[PDB]
C-alpha cells in the first residue's frame with residue numbers, strides 16, 4: 001500500500017530552486033528536475049543538471065519558445081547523456097548546441113507517461129519512482145500570488161496546460177490533500193520556490209494530464 005505522504009526534499013533528491021528567467025524553458029527545468037531525482041536515487045549523488053543543454057539541443061522543441069518534457073528525455077537518450085549545469089551553464093536565451101561529453105553527469109534510457117488525468121497513478125509514480133515532471137495551468141493571478149496553504153482555484157483550466165514543473169511529493173495540510181510542487185521562478189516566489197497544489201480535487205489545474213519521468 002502506497003505511502004500517505006512523500007517528500008523527496010527530505011531524502012536529498014531535490015536540488016535548490018532555480019530561476020528560468022525570461023525564457024520559455026519551464027520544460028527544460030522540469031525535465032532536469034526529474035533526471036536529478038533519478039540520478040540521486042541510482043548513484044547517491046545530488047548534482048545540478050543542465051537545462052541550457054536541453055534548450056539549445058532538443059531540436060524537436062522550440063527552445064525558449066517552449067517544449068515538451070518527453071522530447072527532452074528522448075534527446076538525452078539519443079545523445080547518450082546530459083551535461084551538468086557546471087559544464088553547460090544556464091544563459092536564459094537559446095544558443096547553438098554545444099554539448100560537452102566530458103561534462104556528462106547523467107544518462108537516460110527512455111521515459112514513461114502517467115495515465116492521463118489519473119491522480120492515483122501519479123501518486124503511485126511519485127512514491128515508486130521519485131520526482132515526476134508535470135504540466136499545469138499556472139496562468140491565474142491567484143497562482144502568481146501564492147504564498148502558503150493548499151492552492152485551489154476553480155478558474156484553473158486543465159485543458160490549457162502552460163507551465164512545466166516538478167512534483168517532489170504529496171501529503172495533507174490541515175485537512176487538504178496536496179502535491180508538493182517545485183517551481184522554477186526562483187526562491188522569492190511562492191513558499192521559498194514551492195507551492196502546495198490541491199490533490200484529488202478532480203485533477204485541479206491539469207496536474208496529472210501530461211506527467212512523465214525518465215528511466216535511468
Ligand SMILES: *[C@]1(O)CO[C@@H]2[C@H](Cl)CN(C(=O)[C@H](CC(C)C)NC(=O)c3ccc(-c4nc(N5CCN(C)CC5)sc4F)cc3)[C@@H]21
Nearest residue numbers: 024025026027060061062065066067068135161162163164
Ligand atoms: C514554459 O517556460 C512556461 O511558459 C512557456 C510557454 Cl507559455 C509554455 N511553456 C512550455 O514550454 C510548454 C510546456 C508544456 C509541458 C505545457 N510547452 C509549449 O508551450 C510548447 C511546446 C512545443 C512547442 C513547439 N513548437 C515547435 N515549433 C514552433 C513552430 N515552428 C514552425 C515549428 C517548430 S516544435 C515544438 F515542440 C512550442 C511550445 C513555456
Ligand SMILES: [Cl-]
Nearest residue numbers: 002120123124
Ligand atoms: Cl494509493
Ligand SMILES: [Cl-]
Nearest residue numbers: 004123177200
Ligand atoms: Cl490518496
Ligand SMILES: [Cl-]
Nearest residue numbers: 094095096097
Ligand atoms: Cl552560440
Ligand code: NA
Nearest residue numbers: 060070071074
Ligand atoms: Na519527439
